[PDB]
């Protein structure tokens, strides 16, 4: 009967000490992301199952007016998720983070959907007193704000971790790696990293703006650190080196062009222009005047630095002292009128906050076969029975 189901449901829902353990250990900390691989497409069902489970439990708590229970429940949910994202490392960094980014997004979008309802439809005032409704509204509101905070947090944390993972590979792959014959990580490693980001976000049904934001940030970061590596290289900067650098950066550019990013070049401006300098002639004063127009993103001090560390090749005529003089004279000129590019460290704006929330027409009751959650499964199954009856 219905009252039986409601009874056992109540008994299960007020039992916070078991539900919290099960949720925070088996579902959150014991999360298993599809180890199949990032390139492999999934149904949303297999991506946001924890959030949907949490949504069913929460909505059923709110059904029986268990506000305090929901408070503790969601406090531990938020804290646990942020902690889980904070502790990520290794080969699981990309797939796991995105996973949680999906789930948080699934949770937020629901909380939002709840608030609106509570405010819009009068029916939700029927079974509760004025001040219970008041504290209810207060709860859901503050919860919305807290989930904004959580989304922001795990996004920035994950992105910073990504920057950390790029740090090592990118400098060796872009500055030191030599692809072309006749002129350890390579460009294939970088390209593989970005391939993994792209495919992961694609398969976990993540919105594109987030992808654009992440890759833009990471690329600006690479441009910055690699420029900061180049402008310090002393017995390194040459025409051949310029050629190979140009080739590598070109590979990144092609990756951007082929993966839907229009503003890649703009994100790689400093490396592109440093590559352009090292190749164009720097013998005539005319050549330097043209060089000023080509490197429209480089300060005269940086130009002077790059030029003053140009390593000449066999039988190659050195950069004229008249030219070094002229350049130092333009630097002198515009000094009156630092050389390193400081990399943006974050925190950045959450891209999820710049798009519409996910609509919530329906919630699918589904608890993955391999999952071990007795109480939660009992709750979801009871609710499912109740829906089957109606």
């Amino acid at each position: 009967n219905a009252t039986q189901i409601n009874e056992e449901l109540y008994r299960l829902l007020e039992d916070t000490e078991i539900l919290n353990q099960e949720i925070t250990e088996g579902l959150l900390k014991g999360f298993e992301v599809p180890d199949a691989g990032v390139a492999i497409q999934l149904s949303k069902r297999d991506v946001v199952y924890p959030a949907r489970i949490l949504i069913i439990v929460l909505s059923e708590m709110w059904r029986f007016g268990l506000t305090k229970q929901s408070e503790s429940f969601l406090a531990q949910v938020l804290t646990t998720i942020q902690k889980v994202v904070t502790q990520l490392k290794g080969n699981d960094l990309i797939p796991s983070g995105v996973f949680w980014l999906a789930n948080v997004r699934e949770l937020y979008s629901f909380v939002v959907f709840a608030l609106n309802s509570i405010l819009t439809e009068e029916t939700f005032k029927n079974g509760m007193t004025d001040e219970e409704y008041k504290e209810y509204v207060s709860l859901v509101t503050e919860l919305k704000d807290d989930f904004e905070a959580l989304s922001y947090n795990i996004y920035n944390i994950w992105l910073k971790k990504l920057q950390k993972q790029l740090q090592k590979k990118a400098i060796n792959a872009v500055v030191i790696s030599e692809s072309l014959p006749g002129f350890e990580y390579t460009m294939d490693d970088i390209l593989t990293f970005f391939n993994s980001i792209y495919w992961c976000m694609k398969s976990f049904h993540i919105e594109n703006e987030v992808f654009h934001a992440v890759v833009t940030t990471l690329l600006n970061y690479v441009d910055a650190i690699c420029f900061n590596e180049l402008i310090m290289k002393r017995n390194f900067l040459s025409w051949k080196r310029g050629l190979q650098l140009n080739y590598n950066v070109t590979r990144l550019e092609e990756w951007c062009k082929t993966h839907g990013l229009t503003d890649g070049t703009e994100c790689l401006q400093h490396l592109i222009q440093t590559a352009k300098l090292l190749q164009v002639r720097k013998y005539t004063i005319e050549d330097i005047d043209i060089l000023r127009g080509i490197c429209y993103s480089l300060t005269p001090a940086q130009l002077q630095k790059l030029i003053s560390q140009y390593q000449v090749a066999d039988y190659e005529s050195p950069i004229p002292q008249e030219i070094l003089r002229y350049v130092a004279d333009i630097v002198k000129k515009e000094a009156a009128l630092s050389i390193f590019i400081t990399p943006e460290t974050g925190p950045f704006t959450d891209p999820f906050s710049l798009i519409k929330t996910r609509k919530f027409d329906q919630v699918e009751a589904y608890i993955p076969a391999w999952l071990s959650l007795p109480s939660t499964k009992r709750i979801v199954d009871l609710v499912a029975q109740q829906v089957v009856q109606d």
Binding site: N6, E7, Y10, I55, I56, L58, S59, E60, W62, R63, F64, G65, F110, F113, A114, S117, T123, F124, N126, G127, M128, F360, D361, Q362, V363, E364, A365, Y366, V383, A384, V387, V388
Partner: peptide
């Protein structure tokens, strides 16, 4: 046990 309010989440059925 208290009277049940309207269920917010529109729970959908599923079968295998």
């Amino acid at each position: 046990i208290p009277c049940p309010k309207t269920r917010l989440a529109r729970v959908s059925v599923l079968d295998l």
